[PDB]
Write a protein that binds this ligand. Sequence first.
Ligand SMILES: CCCCCCCCCCCCCCCCCC(=O)OC[C@H](COP(=O)([O-])OCC(O)COP(=O)([O-])OC[C@@H](COC(=O)CCCCCCCCCCCCCCCCC)OC(=O)CCCCCCCCCCCCCCCCC)OC(=O)CCCCCCCCCCCCCCCCC
Ligand SMILES: CCCCCCCCCCCCCCCCCC(=O)OC[C@H](COP(=O)([O-])OCC(O)COP(=O)([O-])OC[C@@H](COC(=O)CCCCCCCCCCCCCCCCC)OC(=O)CCCCCCCCCCCCCCCCC)OC(=O)CCCCCCCCCCCCCCCCC
Ligand SMILES: CCCCCCCCCCCCCCCCCC(=O)OC[C@H](COP(=O)([O-])OCC(O)COP(=O)([O-])OC[C@@H](COC(=O)CCCCCCCCCCCCCCCCC)OC(=O)CCCCCCCCCCCCCCCCC)OC(=O)CCCCCCCCCCCCCCCCC
Ligand SMILES: CCCCCCCCCCCCCCCCCC(=O)OC[C@H](COP(=O)([O-])OCC(O)COP(=O)([O-])OC[C@@H](COC(=O)CCCCCCCCCCCCCCCCC)OC(=O)CCCCCCCCCCCCCCCCC)OC(=O)CCCCCCCCCCCCCCCCC
Ligand SMILES: COC1=C(OC)C(=O)C(C/C=C(\C)CC/C=C(\C)CC/C=C(\C)CC/C=C(\C)CC/C=C(\C)CC/C=C(/C)CC/C=C(\C)CCC=C(C)C)=C(C)C1=O
Ligand SMILES: CCCCCCCC/C=C/CCCCCCCC(=O)OC[C@H](COP(=O)(O)OCCN)OC(=O)CCCCCCC/C=C/CCCCCCCC
Lengths: 49, 49, 221, 209, 149, 269, 185, 37, 23, 99, 119, 119
Amino acid sequence: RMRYLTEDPAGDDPLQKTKDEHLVDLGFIPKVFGANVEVRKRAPHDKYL
Amino acid sequence: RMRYLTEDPAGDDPLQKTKDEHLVDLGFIPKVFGANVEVRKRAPHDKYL
Amino acid sequence: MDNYFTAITLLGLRDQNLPPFKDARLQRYKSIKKMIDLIETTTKLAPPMPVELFMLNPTDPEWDDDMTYPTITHATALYKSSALAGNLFLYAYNYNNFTANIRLRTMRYLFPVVSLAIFGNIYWDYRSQLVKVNLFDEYIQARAQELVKQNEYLLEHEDVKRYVWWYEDLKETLARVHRQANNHKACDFKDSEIILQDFIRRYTNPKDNLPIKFHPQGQTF
Amino acid sequence: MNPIQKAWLKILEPVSYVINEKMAKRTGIIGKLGRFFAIGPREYGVHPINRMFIFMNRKYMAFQAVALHRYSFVKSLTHNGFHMLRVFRHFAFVLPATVLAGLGLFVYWGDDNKCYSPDRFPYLKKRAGDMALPLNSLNQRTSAHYIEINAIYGAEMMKRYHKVWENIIEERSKATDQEKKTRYAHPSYQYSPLPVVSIPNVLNPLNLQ
Amino acid sequence: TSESVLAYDYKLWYLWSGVSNLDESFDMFFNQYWALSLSTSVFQLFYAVILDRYLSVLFQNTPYTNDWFRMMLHSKETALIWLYHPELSWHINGLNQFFTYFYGGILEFVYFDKSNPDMCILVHTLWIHLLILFLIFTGFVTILFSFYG
Amino acid sequence: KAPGQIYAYDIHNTHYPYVNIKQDSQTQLLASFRRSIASINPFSYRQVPSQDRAAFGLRWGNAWYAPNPYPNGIHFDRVFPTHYDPLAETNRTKANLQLIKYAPGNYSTLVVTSEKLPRPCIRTIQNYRRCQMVNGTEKCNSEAQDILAICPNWALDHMKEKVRFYTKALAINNQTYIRAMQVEEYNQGRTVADVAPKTWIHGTRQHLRPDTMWADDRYTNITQTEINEAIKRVEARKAREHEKKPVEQANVNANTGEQPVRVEKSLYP
Amino acid sequence: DFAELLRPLRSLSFNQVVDRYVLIPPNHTFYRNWTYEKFLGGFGLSYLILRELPLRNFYARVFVMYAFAAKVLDHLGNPFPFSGHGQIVAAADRWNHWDVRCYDNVMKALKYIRIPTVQNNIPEATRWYGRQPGHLLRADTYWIPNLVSQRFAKHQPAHWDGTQNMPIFRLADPKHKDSYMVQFR
Amino acid sequence: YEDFVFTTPYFQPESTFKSVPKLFSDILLGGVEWVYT
Amino acid sequence: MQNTTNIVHVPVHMGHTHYFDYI
Amino acid sequence: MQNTTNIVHVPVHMGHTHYFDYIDSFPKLKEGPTLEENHITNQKILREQLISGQQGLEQNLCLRNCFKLSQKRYIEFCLDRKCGGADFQRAATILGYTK
Amino acid sequence: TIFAETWEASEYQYRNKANLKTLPVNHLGKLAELKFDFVEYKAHQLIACHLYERMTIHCMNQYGLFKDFYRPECLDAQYYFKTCVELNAAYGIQKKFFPEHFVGSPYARPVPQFQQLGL
Amino acid sequence: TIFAETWEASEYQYRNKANLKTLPVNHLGKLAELKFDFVEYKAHQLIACHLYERMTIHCMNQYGLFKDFYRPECLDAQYYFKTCVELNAAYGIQKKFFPEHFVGSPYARPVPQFQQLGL
Ligand SMILES: CCCCCCCCCCCCCCCCCC(=O)OC[C@H](COP(=O)([O-])OCC(O)COP(=O)([O-])OC[C@@H](COC(=O)CCCCCCCCCCCCCCCCC)OC(=O)CCCCCCCCCCCCCCCCC)OC(=O)CCCCCCCCCCCCCCCCC
Ligand SMILES: CCCCCCCCCCCCCCCCCC(=O)OC[C@H](COP(=O)([O-])OCC(O)COP(=O)([O-])OC[C@@H](COC(=O)CCCCCCCCCCCCCCCCC)OC(=O)CCCCCCCCCCCCCCCCC)OC(=O)CCCCCCCCCCCCCCCCC
Ligand SMILES: CCCCCCCCCCCCCCCCCC(=O)OC[C@H](COP(=O)([O-])OCC(O)COP(=O)([O-])OC[C@@H](COC(=O)CCCCCCCCCCCCCCCCC)OC(=O)CCCCCCCCCCCCCCCCC)OC(=O)CCCCCCCCCCCCCCCCC
Ligand SMILES: CCCCCCCCCCCCCCCCCC(=O)OC[C@H](COP(=O)([O-])OCC(O)COP(=O)([O-])OC[C@@H](COC(=O)CCCCCCCCCCCCCCCCC)OC(=O)CCCCCCCCCCCCCCCCC)OC(=O)CCCCCCCCCCCCCCCCC
Ligand SMILES: COC1=C(OC)C(=O)C(C/C=C(\C)CC/C=C(\C)CC/C=C(\C)CC/C=C(\C)CC/C=C(\C)CC/C=C(/C)CC/C=C(\C)CCC=C(C)C)=C(C)C1=O
Ligand SMILES: CCCCCCCC/C=C/CCCCCCCC(=O)OC[C@H](COP(=O)(O)OCCN)OC(=O)CCCCCCC/C=C/CCCCCCCC
């Protein structure tokens, strides 16, 4: 369970992801969402570890 | 002039910049802009090189 | 842990001692949480003053010269002087041969010509370095006075008086702040909150969307 | 033996008496210690550096005598003294000129002794703690005029601010609590008097001028 | 790069310890106003706020706020002026914000090294260098150009 | 044309204060002897700098002194994990190549700095503001395009991010304003008129007694008899206050395979 | 003792304090580093007198020189050449690095220890400034084509056009057409 | 403000009293890599 | 950034033993 | 990502020579006037500026120095105190900052 | 500002940057190096940077500021105190305006809302 | 899709990713390796992946598909043709839906609007 909940920092390169500056020029204005600060990470049942 | 107009890719680390999810939780909803595709980079006068 | 001296002062550690038990000692830490938010806000209401008061604008074209600091290479001049002296010892140590042996006549004849040219290079560089240093020292002093007499008037602006009056109001305001009790609660500074709120309400408008407005010559830290 | 060794003897004359006469023969360890630090003629006291100079001085000087002792190029031009056909007469003064240039071998050793080093890039690395810098560091520089002129400007202007600062504190001391809390205040502020308390008007807490 | 190198050198360290009254690294303002705040006074809390604003000024080591460029109230020369005019911390924090907003870059966090290394430019160090090479050249002559035996 | 002297020279009045930090008899006696002959001693080294002559730092015997680096738990292992604790030893042991490498900056602090934008990019910004206050914003298009073109892109990103930071700090300062200007339940309806004519000294130890029994001589004349009686009165008040007790809540961190809440720790284990 | 530190300031006015300790007349002609030359140069001068000790036993002077080397190695550190640098703690004064205050890269290298990010790269601004090519002299005797060609070259006056970046020489860039023979490593 | 315009969206003062329970998260300098030999 | 860097969400206790580092 | 990677915004031509890599030319490079021609051209401007561009200069310099200030309210203070009660818009037209 | 005597070290370590410094607790071992006699209460040794402050006072009372305060046990306390308040001032500011840089902050790696997942 | 015979080599290189492949022009040198006689027009050799196709047809006409087509000059043309149209199909899709990946696109490194600078 600890290694399931052991993540690495910074994730992946945001520059390899779709840009918001491009979606605007494509016709879709993205909506800005806030951070979900109420969720607690937990491990699944043992059978999935 | 060529080395003034010689940049490197990817700029700086985005994760070290202000997040949009954080501004929303602070009370400021950021506005999304579009890319400026009309500007052409040029070198300044020789005295500034 | 910012605002260290302010917090240590509010807890009373400058005159008394904290309770030896964790229950009350910890409540006393949480009691100043309001006052820190207040004193930090007060420190961000200072009015602006001309930046061109104790600091010349570095973006001025006058400073595009990108001038360097002229120096004197004493260590270089001393080594080359000791090396030239070494040649005089080599001639002295071998005086009888250079002087009496005709196979070394060319050295006896031209050794002093080369030594003078070496000395000339040594002293020429030192002398030139010295002249440039003096030309630099006398210019920075003359040009500094012209810039002073030019910008003295900036001290006559009323914003300098406005800046000092704000600093004194904060001194008199913080001098009136006092601890009202020792119950280890936020109510120990009950009356002081009203005093500081009056100070903040005196330089801001609480009934606005952004009572603290941003301007490039303002306070952020 | 040399004069510098003799000078040590006159200075260490009493020390030698204590080690060689008393300690060097008393008994046991005090003997081994005194006989080990005995004072006298140096065993293997020769100085190889002195000798190294004497040898290289002599060998290089024998070379100077050969290189400098050449038949003249000027005298061979007339075809009247000792030289009719000399197809390499123009090489006569090459070795002499090469030996005379050797007098600057040590005077001009390294880059710093051949130019004004502060105008060269390697000087910046030495002043940066022998640290690698970009090659264009000599150009990205702020004017030395600004750094020194602004340092004087800031101070000459502070002496004038100190006098202005005093006149303001004085004029404010003669002001009413109502005036000093409404002047320069926000328009939306409503003045409400505070209880009067004793708060001194001290210019400098430290007893300075 | 490839340039002349010495065999033995000395590196100086202009340490900004802040605990030595022999040099200019002694923070006279901080030590005076700190001891002033220890004694019971009516301005005891005011002096604390002053010291906290002074620390927020050292925290801003920008081109316009640093000792390298000899800026007022940031260099060793103007350390005593803090004793007379401690009210100028706000002016500094605002000035640095004005130039940073218009003519500056992003405020980045870095570690300020107080140890200030500098290679001492000496004369005798090159004498030692020549002596070492003189021994190396003599061996070249002693081994290959010695005809005394 | 006398050389300039620093403020430290007027405290000691000499350039040769033989300050050695090593507190051994051999060292302090030699310093006192060397401190007296520094005027006519060729083996004299300065420790107070001047305009004409540099100086040395503090001496440690024959070597030089520097304070112990501020404790830093960051380290790098080479052969085996050392578990370096900077609080377990007074002086930091030297770093052996095969054992440990310490963090950089033995003597370093945390500051915030900023890069200086290119000079030509600065001149375009000066020209925009100048044309703005003179001709207005609507007539500064040419000066705005020169900025976007001459200023390198890395600078435009900095300018773009400065606005987002100051926008963030602007909110962080206004949230503190709201918490600071909030009127608590214990100050409802109270104004400056209800404030007492007291200053900071009136909340100190001389005027306001601390919450300790031996701060002054208040309880120095108390006897065991008076104590037994006081224990009876406090127990009397508890006959009316102990009637209430908070109810036990559920443990939000009951599941060990769940990210626990950083709940306030108990005063005692 | 805190009041004893301010004794010279109570007798002075603010203008006298500035003119005394702040506005010191600039004079950059002194040999400030003589303090270090005298101290460290004394090791060599001391070795001249110490190598002449009348100690008879050769191995007793081995001990003396071992003690003298210990005194030096407390400052020099590494006994081998071309290995490292000595360590001298010096006093901090306004004249530290006084002749290089104009250079920006020297300040960053001495002062700033930058924190590496996840996107492990040198700051783009630092990389961009680093591409602005420095000035490299044309004079070159190491490349035999220039050793011959530059003997027939005519040095013409370069009339100042009002700038500080006139490329009257070649540029220190590997891709410059007059510097491609230089190895940048 | 003082002859300067700083465009910002409408500030929501309600975000000040946003309930954000702190969560546990420990960083381990010295851990596991992706592959081992 | 350090290669052996991990972020853990649940508490762990490390052994204070010489020559070893483990949970 | 290759460490020696650069993004260039102007055309460059690389030489295809063995053992060497460099920029041998720039497309459509025009050789301007020589340093001597620009020198002569500039001296004609400085000569006229020295003979006919030195009257009424002290006033223009004060106006230029006033406009190098940070805030507008300080400029008006500089004009009224140093430039003899000048107007902001009237001085900006002289300096050529007006459209 | 820290409103307690104890703080979680991970809360003052960076999540997206290399960790080259920590915010350690007061070094209680330095308190035993003072040779003279002094009175110190255990209730004041845990609060950040205050122990080094009281030690500096004890050393400035026993000794002065000239030729007697210059001993290793007293100068390290003054250097620690001066260094502790500078680091804590910067960390406190960085926590106030850059809370997303530190571990434990929900903004260092924001968790998305369920509306952003497309389910 | 490419609507010409020529394409800028940089327009198909990645800006934020390592460049491990190029999109080269047709290898005309492979056309001179065919020993037999054939008719080829220069107007068809520059278009992408087509030259390898025509060469494959010429080799499948002169020889067949069994024991005579299995020679290096003919198998490399079949492999180049099968590989050229696979890469170009992938590069074409990456150009259609991921134009921000390539050099020359204004979205690879978006230039901000002037309203984002705060002037
Ligand atoms: C572990 C590494 C350590 C490294 C650091 C230490 C390095 C140590 C190496 C030392 C080697 C040099 C020796 C330095 C002195 C130490 C004492 C010593 O010499 O050894 C013991 C030495 C005994 O020699 P020995 O090795 O024991 O055995 C003897 C041999 O068997 C037979 O006897 P001999 O007489 O036939 O042999 C002579 C003997 C000893 O000969 C000597 O007497 C040594 C003389 C050294 C020069 C001294 C004058 C230098 C100029 C002074 C300028 C003053 C400037 C300031 C002016 C005032 C204003 C500020 O050997 C040498 O000559 C050695 C010379 C080495 C070369 C020096 C020149 C090389 C120049 C190349 C360029 C390098 C530039 C740097 C040079 C720096 C110079 C400052 O003592 C004496 O000789 C006593 C001499 C008494 C009479 C001398 C009267 C004064 C003469 C002055 C010179 C007059 C000539 C013209 C000068 C004009 C000046 C303007
Ligand atoms: C006012 C103050 C008070 C004064 C009053 C008191 C008066 C008392 C005076 C007392 C004594 C004065 C000493 C001189 C009198 C000597 C009388 C005598 O009977 O002695 C015979 C005496 C007897 O021989 P020795 O005793 O057996 O040995 C004598 C020497 O040790 C070694 O003898 P060596 O013959 O073996 O030496 C040969 C060496 C002698 O050293 C020199 O003199 C240097 C020569 C450099 C000049 C060469 C001229 C070449 C012709 C060019 C034609 C055009 C000229 C235009 C000039 C324009 C200038 C901008 O010359 C060479 O190396 C010959 C090879 C030349 C190079 C090979 C290639 C040549 C063609 C290159 C063409 C390149 C063109 C390219 C482009 C062209 C496009 C159009 O021989 C001498 O000539 C003694 C000369 C001693 C040296 C004097 C110079 C000392 C250095 C002074 C510093 C420089 C200042 C002068 C510079 C002059 C212009 C560069
Ligand atoms: C299989 C078994 C064999 C295996 C053996 C082991 C393998 C090797 C293991 C290596 C271990 C690692 C090495 C250490 C790592 C660190 C390396 C390093 O950083 O070096 C950088 C350093 C940088 O220099 P660079 O990168 O090569 O060149 C750049 C610059 O040019 C340099 O600076 P610069 O531009 O300022 O210099 C300008 C130049 C200026 O020069 C000139 O302008 C003209 C030349 C004037 C020469 C004058 C000499 C000075 C004294 C003259 C006085 C007498 C005058 C005579 C008449 C003169 C006529 C004019 O000045 C000189 O460099 C003069 C050099 C003189 C050398 C002697 C001439 C003959 C060549 C050497 C032959 C002997 C060595 C070959 C051994 C073969 C054995 C098989 O390298 C050196 O140059 C130093 C060489 C020594 C390094 C090794 C030191 C190891 C430490 C332990 C030994 C300590 C010495 C004790 C000797 C005791 C003898 C009994
Ligand atoms: C009429 C006959 C005479 C009757 C009178 C007899 C009485 C004479 C004595 C009274 C008059 C003396 C005149 C000068 C005033 C000095 C007063 C004073 O207190 O000095 C103490 C003086 C300095 O005290 P310090 O502050 O502790 O500095 C030394 C520290 O080591 C430094 O440690 P550091 O780490 O801080 O610094 C390192 C140091 C480097 O220091 C070291 O490397 C030395 C380290 C020691 C060796 C390492 C092993 C450790 C040994 C420990 C055990 C030693 C016990 C010795 C006990 C001696 C007790 C006094 O480098 C420097 O800092 C700069 C030094 C270079 C500066 C320039 C020096 C110029 C000297 C001018 C010489 C002029 C005379 C000519 C010389 C001879 C010419 C042939 O200490 C000494 O005793 C130095 C001894 C050096 C040997 C001198 C040998 C020559 C003496 C010549 C006498 C007169 C001519 C004789 C002619 C022969 C026929 C008569
Ligand atoms: C003139 O013609 C020529 C010759 O003559 C034929 C040559 O021999 C030669 C060959 C030259 C040589 C063989 C000499 C080569 C010398 C070289 C390479 C350098 C030698 C270096 C050393 C011996 C090491 C010296 C080390 C130092 C000086 C560092 C420490 C300082 C010391 C020892 C001195 C202290 C410094 C001072 C300024 C104080 C000076 C002290 C004195 C003068 C005291 C003197 C005392 C007495 C008793 C005389 C040439 C090239 C030549 O051109
Ligand atoms: C007989 C004389 C032989 C001398 C050697 C022959 C060649 C002479 C070559 C002359 C070249 C002169 C060029 C100028 C070099 C400049 C030197 C220099 O800058 O020194 C400066 C500086 C002056 O200090 P400041 O006041 O800060 O500077 C003010 C500048 N006006 O001088 C110094 O560095 C002091 C040290 C001087 C050299 C070393 C002195 C010691 C000499 C050793 C031998 C003497 C032994 C006996 C000493 C007695 C001790 C009790």
